[PDB]
């Protein structure tokens, strides 16, 4: 599985960042949660938020007001709209595939994440 991103890159303060993510060579995108994380220079990884093909979405509690996440677009796609981004908070943005191993009836919550199995090449944005 490969993840390839596309965005402006050169983003100024008080502007809405946009970063789409194409997913290639993935047989079953429905059974993996799709998430965004970030790493600025010298700081640990910060979780933006995740979405699923059912439609369930969950964002980080102290980032949600800025960020929203896009949905499927035939070709397996998901994006990240970050309104009101500042140049004081930049970093290196990664797509990630929180895989799901299902062991029972998925309706009853019988599943557990395999973790961020595959990672995109990543793009630095300002």
């Amino acid at each position: 599985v490969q993840l390839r991103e596309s965005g402006p890159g050169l983003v100024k303060p008080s502007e809405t960042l946009s970063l789409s993510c194409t997913v290639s060579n993935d047989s079953r995108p429905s059974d993996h949660s799709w998430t965004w994380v970030r790493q600025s220079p010298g700081k640990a990884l910060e979780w933006i938020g995740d979405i699923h093909y059912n439609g369930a979405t969950t964002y980080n509690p102290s980032l949600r007001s800025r960020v929203r996440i896009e949905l499927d677009q035939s070709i397996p796609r998901f994006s990240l709209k970050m309104t009101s981004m500042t140049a004081a908070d930049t970093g290196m943005y990664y797509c990630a595939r929180n895989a799901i191993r299902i062991y029972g009836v998925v309706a009853l919550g019988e599943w557990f994440h395999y973790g961020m199995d595959v990672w995109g090449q990543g793009t630095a944005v300002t």
């Binding site: 990884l45 191993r101 961020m116 090449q121």
Partner: peptide, 19 residues
């Protein structure tokens, strides 16, 4: 879960929940 990150390179999965 645990992940390993090199400088510059993307993180990878080192400790997963197989079962």
């Amino acid at each position: 879960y645990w992940y390993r990150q090199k400088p510059g390179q993307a993180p990878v999965l080192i400790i997963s929940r197989s079962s």
